[PDB]
Paper text:
In its natural form the metal is zinc, but insulin is also known to have affinity towards other transition metals, including Mn, Fe, Co, Ni, Cu and Cd, all in the +2 oxidation state. The coordination sphere for each metal site is thus completed by water molecules, some of which are weakly coordinated and easily exchanged.
Primary damage, i.e. photoreduction, was followed directly by XANES as a function of radiation dose, while secondary damage in the form of structural changes around the Cu atoms after exposure to different radiation doses was studied by crystallography using a laboratory diffractometer. The water molecules have been removed from the structures and difference maps have been calculated. At low radiation doses the difference maps indicate hexacoordinated copper in both copper sites, which is in agreement with the XANES results and analogous to the Ni insulin structure. A tetragonally distorted hexacoordinated geometry of copper in both sites is in agreement with the results from the non-destructive EPR experiment, the low-dose X-ray experiments (in-house XRD) and the low-temperature XAS (saccharose-protected samples at 20 K). EPR clearly demonstrates that in the low-dose crystal the actual ligand field experienced by the copper centre in both sites I and II is close to tetragonal and therefore one histidine residue must be different from the other two.
Numbering used by the authors:
A (entry chain A): 1 to 21
B (entry chain B): 2 to 29
The structure:
């Protein structure tokens, strides 16, 4: 998931928006 | 631009992106 992907790989701020309420 | 974000640096980015909307931080 995102926590792992952002750290183990890379992620975009657009991918992070999926986690907003 | 792409991001390498571990630990507390990820929750800072979540805070920035989501702001007043708030967010869930849900690791595995
Ligand atoms: Cu650090």
């Amino acid at each position: 998931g995102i926590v792992e992907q952002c750290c183990a790989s890379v992620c975009s701020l657009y991918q992070l928006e999926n986690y907003c309420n | 631009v792409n991001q390498h974000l571990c630990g507390s640096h990820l929750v800072e980015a979540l805070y920035l992106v989501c702001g007043e909307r708030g967010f869930f931080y849900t690791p595995k």
